[PDB]
Amino acid sequence: GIDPFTLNHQVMDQVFDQVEHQIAQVLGAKGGPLVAVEIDSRFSDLGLSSLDLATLISNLEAVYGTDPFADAVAITSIVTVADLARAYAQQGVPGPSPDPLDAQLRDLRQL
Numbered sequence: 001g002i003d004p005f006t007l008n009h010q011v012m013d014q015v016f017d018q019v020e021h022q023i024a025q026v027l028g029a030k031g032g033p034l035v036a037v038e039i040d041s042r043f044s045d046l047g048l049s050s051l052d053l054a055t056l057i058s059n060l061e062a063v064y065g066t067d068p069f070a071d072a073v074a075i076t077s078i079v080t081v082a083d084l085a086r087a088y089a090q091q092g093v094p095g096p097s098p099d100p101l102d103a104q105l106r107d108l109r110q111l
Contacts, residue, residue: 008089015060015085022059026052039082046081053078060088070095 097103
């Protein structure tokens with residue numbers, strides 16, 4: 001039986017499996033040999049180039065319909081599989097304010 005603590009691993013594994021399938025899709029479509037996706041592996045090491053990495057993200061975005069720019073604001077922080085998976089693993093929790101105008105109303109307590 002799963003616990004809250006192990007659920008963090010489950011959700012991380014969940015997005016990992018998704019990413020793995022998408023990586024195989026990318027390399028498979030391009031006609032390149034499918035490399036084994038290790039969680040601590042670098043996308044560039046798996047065979048994903050700068051453009052392919054961006055494509056991989058978009059392929060995952062098109063799955064969930066979500067894409068956090070909060071923590072994943074720095075594309076250079078997306079190096080290993082765990083880095084990209086981490087971003088989408090933290091899905092379901094309100095982080096930044098979706099609207100900056102109402103966020104302004106929260107700060108602006110004066111006239």
